[PDB]
Ligand code: SF4
């Protein structure tokens with residue numbers, strides 16, 4: 001899964017992009033639920049939140065180096 005840096009500007013521009021509602025608005029920065037973040041697998045080819053993030057603050061979470069299989073499985077548990 002991914003997570004948000006402290007460079008987050010809280011522009012909120014990423015919430016729409018997320019297909020799993022894994023981003024929660026915070027203060028000073030936003031927080032991603034590693035439980036809901038499938039890195040967009042099962043939805044897109046690239047994580048959508050990054051495509052609109054100006055601060056470039058959504059790195060890979062070393063605490064959760066999941067596999068596409070795992071990620072794909074996480075995706076389903078959330079929708080179908
Ligand atoms: S789009 Fe980037 S800066 Fe803006 S809230 Fe999301 S993570 Fe932070």
Ligand code: SF4
Pocket residue numbers: 002017018019020021022023032036037038039040041047048049050
């Ligand atoms: S990488 Fe995809 S799944 Fe994870 S937080 Fe961003 S938009 Fe949601």
